[model samples]
Target chain A: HTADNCIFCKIIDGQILCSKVYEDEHVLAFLDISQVTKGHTLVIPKVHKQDIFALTPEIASHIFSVVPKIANAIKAEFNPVGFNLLNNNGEKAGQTVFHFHLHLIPRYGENDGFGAVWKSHQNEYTMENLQNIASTIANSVK
Target chain B: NHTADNCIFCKIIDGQILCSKVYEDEHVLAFLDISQVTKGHTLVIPKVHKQDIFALTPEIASHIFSVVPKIANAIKAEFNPVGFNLLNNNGEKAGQTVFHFHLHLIPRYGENDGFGAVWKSHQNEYTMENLQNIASTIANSVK
Candidate 1:
């Protein structure tokens, strides 16, 4: 999809400027405007994709293969203790941009400006629920 | 490189520790994340023992991601989350309890599905120079 109005597309075409972290044949990595933490970056496919659901295996393969390369680069330059790689798919997941992008946030500590205190609802379900949910999810796989 | 003795995910892979399996093949396995960050929160992983993303080969990473769509689609059909998230924590400080490599697929139905509204609240303003410098530093370090 040639997204003429997409900001990421513009950045790809050089119509807009971005702080580029890395680039190869299939993907581009750049700094996120919201610097969630130092060295926070976004990795995206060269082609326009609304989200993961729109991705092809070939594109996903090439793009993800580039992730560790960027992560290691940040590890070398920024020297963070750890990292949190987050990709939001839709509005419910707080995806501001429709274009698929993976956020690479460097973690200096718990207070490093990003928090993922995910609450657990494990007690709400039983083994039967788990089995049903698991089987259903598996059944939908092509 | 092959297997870790004390790793929990390795135990799951070996059938030593039981998990609610979602999908499995010879090289990859996906199961429900015990934590259930959201409904249908699943963990997809390589059968091999890799500590984190840095330890992963391009082939392994590609293989893992190539199958992610199917697994995600499965969860999408089952839970009907409006959206989902792919989260991977790389180090202990990043809250990675298991040393094995895995990707978290969290289904989100919306309206406080457990994610804090404050995720986007911590915004930092940076000059163009600041961005470029940081970018250049990382680009230079890339292999």
Candidate 2:
């Protein structure tokens, strides 16, 4: 869906309300309405951009550049033992929101509610599958 | 805030300092890390002195991440490794070294590499009360 109809875009533009932690000319940091963990926050650009690929390099760096500060702020307030900074890109990739944003998830310990991503599967491996996919993906690289 | 003289990575870009260069563009530089945790490890750094990801302008950050897939693929092609780790150490406890912003592209094999991650088990047994408390507390923080 377009940003005009997106709920997150309205929040970014002040059409909606949210608890903001960090804000600057280029970026906005706020608590996720439904967090995966305590002190979970989402940071995004003030500009509406769908997916990571749509953002410019300066916009991406600006968002990342402040990640540590936001994480540390969470640590000081919530005292989480650890954290994970994650971004899911496409619909198939678990990106629920069309607008690009980053998730700052606080971690406690094992059984702390965070799970490993991309766990290895136990499917039988064939050299043919490896060769074909590898060749195709490799050549597609820019 | 830093001009060419005060910036460290800029010095490397200017050719006044030494760096094992990996990737470069008009605005950024990627280089082989001297203290590599794993083989084929490299650091992708911006030319500016942005301390962490938050401080970066979106224009710059977008360019860096857009390049990540390409860079990751190149590392795989060069090393022919099974897996790779895309890591960024933000604050001090998170293990950031230089104040200048950078993203680590670490290549991973099976075992015995500088890349070792740990997960600590919870001392307290899993309780519904604890889980609810923890989850709700965190969930509330989201707007």
Candidate 3:
């Protein structure tokens, strides 16, 4: 239920305060102090988990079960034109907080603080290459 | 079991539309996203016509997620990204362009890469009392 140095564990255990948006027995939803948009929120499990790689399906399902309810509330309150759900796993992936959390980012317009830039790869993969990659991944699945 | 008549993803699932498929099983499919948000940008989705996370059954979600790490590892092996992100958008108000439910597996390189997000702190927006009020309101509204 807790970990020694995890900040999110402290939040879950009442050691720290957060602008909580929703909570049930398994997960806790709270507003991010840093609002990427109007209703930026972070949803985390009550128990500490490092990242997606560490999450069991039961835990993931339990945590994600509330996402829609929370998303609807954000939409009703902040009224963003659109939103994006993001989860960063490692430090290199922009995961500053080690605790597993999903970000609900509300987007307003082109100049909105949150956006994802997608530039196509300069070189396209050959069908053979694609097949090889796919096979490698498929074989790894358990 | 259901397929939306106009759904582009359904077309892909049916082989009517070609995709750079990464993995496919009885229940789920993954393919390279045409728009590479990073290097190895891929998308994973249920083969059925679930519109979004709100509509996804727990079993379907679990099945799709079970293979995500392997897909991530594949992306890493192929693209050699330092890290990656998993993204899903729900309603149109949440930037869901395609009506079919999909989870994006985006690899990360650096700050200048084709993907970035901005988060500015609005520390002054809510006080302790206001925070509790908002939390209670949301909690009470949940079904």
lDDT (CA) per prediction: 0.85, 0.62, 0.75
Q: In candidate 3, which residue ranges exceed 4 Å CA deviation?
A: B1-3, B54-66, B77-80, B90-95
List runs of model 1 lying over 4 Å from the truth. Answer: B1-3, B120-125
lDDT of 1 by residue, A87-139 (tens): 88888787888899888888887557787857888788888888887888888
> What's the best-to-worst order under DockQ?
1, 3, 2
Docking class of 2: incorrect
* TM-score for each predicted model, relative to the true structure: 0.94, 0.53, 0.84
Angstrom error of the Cα, residue A1, model 2: value is 1.5
Which has the better lDDT: candidate 2, or candidate 3? Answer: 3
Clashes of 3: 2
Which of candidates 1 and 3 reaches a greater DockQ?
Answer: 1
Predicted candidate 2 versus true structure: per-residue lDDT over B39-93, tens digit per residue = 5566787776677655667566766665665766666676676555555655554
Clashes of each: 0, 38, 2
Per-prediction DockQ scores?
Answer: 0.71, 0.09, 0.46
Q: Highest TM-score: which candidate?
A: 1
What overall lDDT, based on C-alpha atoms, would model 1 receive against the true structure? 0.85
Please list, in the order the candidates appear, how each scores on TM-score for chain B only.
0.88, 0.77, 0.86
Measured with DockQ on alpha carbons, how good is candidate 2?
A: 0.09
Model 2: per-residue Cα lDDT at residue A40? 63
